[PDB]
UniProtKB/Swiss-Prot annotation:
It is found in: Plastid, Chloroplast. GO terms for molecular function: copalyl diphosphate synthase activity; magnesium ion binding; miltiradiene synthase activity; terpene synthase activity. This is Bifunctional diterpene synthase, chloroplastic. Keywords: Chloroplast, Isomerase, Lyase, Magnesium, Metal-binding, Plastid, Transit peptide. It comes from the Eukaryota. It comes from Selaginella moellendorffii (Spikemoss). InterPro entries: Isoprenoid_synthase_dom_sf, Terpene_synth_N, Terpene_synth_N_sf, Terpene_synthase-like, Terpene_synthase_metal-bd, Terpenoid_cyclase/PrenylTrfase. One of its GO terms (cellular component) is chloroplast. A motif (DXDD motif) lies at residues 296-299. Mg(2+) 4 binds at residues 296, 298. One of its GO terms (biological process) is diterpenoid biosynthetic process. Bifunctional diterpene cyclase that catalyzes the successive two-step type-B (protonation-initiated cyclization) and type-A (ionization-initiated cyclization) reactions of geranylgeranyl diphosphate (GGDP) producing successively (+)-copalyl diphosphate and miltiradiene. Its cofactor is Mg(2+).
Length: 767
């Protein structure tokens, strides 16, 4: 299971170094033998008998594999090995060097060319034109290889039929995918001088060194040669399939770190990388690199989501260019089709939407429908990624707002391929995206997240027993602790996790009793004691409420002691009044709903929501837990946070979601739900499905307002951890009522049971 034996501090320092390099546009991509050899054809400008890149020629000689091929060493794929080997042999032969390398390479091709077949690996980009061209070039140089098999003959025929259907003016009219593989069109009557207008900012052709080298040899364009000279020097005279991909690489690295849950180590360095990315973001999105020709929706959606989530101002106008009639989207404008990766990232991006961003509703519906209809049996069938379809499955089953951090992180830890490879002109690797260090760190942090759970659950099970809740059920505890662990996972939140679990347990107990209330006068008895918050009146309560209220009262004292030790600027009296204040207001609103139901009273919808927004309870755990979320506090914050816009949005979102799901259940029962009912009495024309549709629409509109208030830092905003808690409280509510998710933690329920049993068995083992 252990992948690296170094201290965590050494792994963290290593990754911080990688990130700071990416924040300057410097990354790591495997060299391409095919591209290095292509570019190494170029003769010196002043002496055409001398190569411009003799260091590249030495690299080719020194990087040949022991079987005589070139290409990706760890994953043998015949398209990759054959195409790469042909390029190196052509270039070695062109310069009349590397005789032993040529002998060893031609031998490989004599033994392996007959093994080439259809459907034997991923289609390399442009393969249908790069492979026949390269084979003809080797044939023209007299290399001792098989010049035709059934496979190559059928391929060439298929390619030439495809080529005849393309007007050659289209290849210089507008950017097409063929600009990445111009070396395959070497012999067509292309207008090479007009092709020069489709070059990128740096002189390249879709960032491909070989494609660019071909245009250079056709046109002698200066900027194209300089692109190559500088690429060669930057990459130590072995170039990749495309360069630079400084935006794609840095965003995929940051994404990987966040999906794995190890961003906790790298806050400042991630900020450095996102500042670099943001310096290239435009209102038309981005492409894969800072010099690239065209924008694409994969890079644009990745940048859009991560930048917005980190508080940067990005416009959804960046997606307009990808719109197609019928509210479909393309990855590249003019494309014939697209793939899964970009739809997965488009789907993720669409869910951090703000109000009045209707394009993100269209992108969500398009990507979600695409993802639902993929062919799972055949997707990434060569396993370039460890589990791409598992990522798609997880994303379809877990809405952004219904997902908690560690739930996401622990699922992605199982999907993450430390040895993934990538497909372009040939096979390549991104060692900063896929490596053992990320996974080792992710497993260590996962383990750190578990280390505190035994003691915390043991405190909670002991509190359950000593509170005598068994004398008026404990299975509610593991689920509550599960979700607070998933959202506030850093070990510094120990008191928050425990005080949150205690508070949720208490209110669950109180509300389950209040919803059983035989009749109203016991409620009015309860309300009076709560209003005075006077423990000396607990004898006046119906005895089933004495146990919970006494513990509610006690836990407030304990909470007050703990919070006053943290907040020296706050008096214990102030904190105690604050806490008993919010729990009074909460229990009062829950009584009101119990009273209404026994009365049969149905208020207007505005009147119902005035109380049901309070009785939904989530806000009371926000206002308590902010005492323990690590932020400095003031009396003004405590006095004004209940009415702040984020807390209002919280109460609205959680009530709507509760009532929408409660109606589905009460449907199968005879009973009418009070949300739909109150809506229908207010709007005497509405079906129950109207009420639902209205609630669902209000829910989705309010979630967009929550995103805008949370991800963007506003003037006089709440402190960061308070906004975080409010946002995660909403997500903890939504996942609890997502009944797809609940249907399908075991660790925690058994631990709690065994621990409880030892308190009741006390000190004697039973058989």
């Amino acid at each position: 299971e252990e992948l690296d034996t170094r201290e965590t501090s050494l792994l963290v320092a290593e990754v911080k170094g990688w990130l700071m390099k990416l924040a300057s546009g410097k990354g790591e991509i495997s060299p391409s033998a095919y591209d290095t050899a292509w570019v190494a054809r170029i003769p010196s400008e002043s002496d055409s008998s001398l190569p411009e890149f003799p260091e590249a020629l030495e690299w080719i000689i020194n990087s040949q594999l022991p079987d005589g091929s070139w290409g990706d060493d760890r994953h043998l794929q015949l398209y990759d090995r054959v195409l790469s080997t042909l390029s190196c042999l052509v270039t070695l032969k062109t310069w009349d060097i590397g005789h032993n390398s040529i002998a060893q390479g031609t031998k490989f091709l004599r033994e392996n060319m007959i093994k080439l077949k259809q459907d034997d690996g991923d289609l390399l980009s442009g393969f249908e034109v790069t492979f026949p061209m390269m084979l003809h070039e080797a044939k023209q140089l007299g290399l001792d290889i098989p010049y035709e098999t059934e496979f190559t003959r059928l391929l060439e025929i298929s390619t030439k039929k495809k080529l005849a259907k393309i007007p050659l003016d289209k290849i210089h009219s507008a950017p097409t995918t063929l600009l990445y593989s111009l070396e395959g069109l070497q012999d067509l009557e292309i207008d090479w001088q007009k092709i020069l207008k489709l070059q990128s900012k740096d002189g390249s052709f879709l960032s491909s060194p070989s494609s660019t080298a071909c245009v250079y040899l056709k046109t002698k364009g200066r900027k194209s040669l300089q692109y190559l000279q500088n690429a060669m020097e930057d990459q130590n005279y072995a170039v990749p399939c495309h360069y630079p991909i400084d935006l794609f690489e840095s965003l995929w690295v940051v994404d990987t770190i966040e999906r794995l849950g190890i961003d906790v180590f790298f806050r400042d360095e991630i900020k450095a990388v996102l500042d670099y990315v943001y310096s290239f973001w435009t209102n038309e999105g981005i492409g894969w690199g800072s010099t690239c020709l065209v924008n694409d929706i994969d890079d644009t959606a990745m940048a859009f989501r991560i930048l917005r989530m980190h508080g940067y101002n990005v416009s959804t106008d960046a997606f307009n260019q990808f719109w197609l009639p019928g509210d479909k989207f393309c990855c590249f404008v003019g494309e014939l089709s697209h793939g899964v990766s970009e739809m997965l990232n488009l789907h993720r991006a669409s869910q951090v939407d703000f109000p009045n961003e209707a394009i993100l509703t269209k992108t969500f519906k398009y990507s979600h429908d695409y993802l639902l209809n993929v062919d799972s049996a055949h997707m990434d069938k060569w396993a370039t990624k460890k589990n791409l379809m598992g990522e798609v499955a997880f994303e379809l089953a877990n809405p952004f707002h219904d997902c908690l951090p560690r739930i996401y992180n622990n699922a992605y830890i199982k999907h993450y391929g430390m040895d993934d490879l990538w497909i372009a002109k040939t096979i390549y690797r991104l060692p900063l995206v896929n490596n053992k260090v990320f996974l080792e760190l992710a497993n260590r942090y996962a383990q750190q997240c578990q280390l505190y759970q035994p003691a915390e659950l043991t405190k909670l099970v002991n509190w359950w027993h000593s509170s005598r809740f068994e004398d008026i059920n404990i299975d509610m505890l593991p689920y509550i602790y599960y979700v607070i662990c998933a959202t506030f996972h850093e070990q510094e939140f120990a008191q928050l996790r425990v005080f949150f679990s205690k508070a949720c347990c208490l209110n669950t107990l109180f509300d389950d009793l209040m919803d059983c209330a035989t009749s109203i006068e016991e409620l009015d008895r309860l309300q009076n004691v709560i209003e005075k918050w006077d423990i000396s009146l607990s004898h006046e309560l119906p005895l089933e409420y004495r146990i919970p209220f006494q513990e509610f009262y006690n836990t407030v004292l304990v909470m007050t002691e703990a919070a006053s030790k943290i907040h020296k600027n706050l008096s214990p009296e102030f904190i105690c009044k604050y806490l008993s204040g919010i729990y009074t207001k909460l229990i009062k609103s829950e009584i009101a709903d119990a009273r209404w139901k026994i009365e049969g009273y149905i208020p207007s919808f505005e009147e119902y929501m005035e109380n049901a927004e309070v009785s939904i309870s989530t806000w009371v755990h926000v206002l308590m837990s902010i005492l323990f979320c690590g932020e400095p506090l003031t009396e003004e914050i405590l006095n004004t946070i209940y009415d702040s816009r984020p807390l209002k949005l919280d109460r609205i979102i959680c009530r709507l979601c509760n009532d929408i799901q409660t109606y589905k259940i009460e449907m199968k029962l005879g009973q009418p739900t009070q949300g739909v009912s109150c809506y229908m009495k207010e709007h005497p024309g509405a079906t129950e499905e109207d009420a639902l549709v209205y609630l669902q629409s209000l829910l989705e509109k309010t979630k967009r307002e929550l995103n805008e208030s949370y991800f963007i830092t506003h003037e006089n905003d709440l402190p960061k951890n308070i906004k975080r808690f409010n946002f995660e409280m909403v997500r903890m509510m939504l996942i609890t009522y997502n009944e797809t998710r609940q249907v399908d933690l075991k660790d925690m329920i058994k631990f709690c049971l065994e621990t409880y049993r030892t308190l009741l068995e006390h000190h004697h083992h039973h058989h």
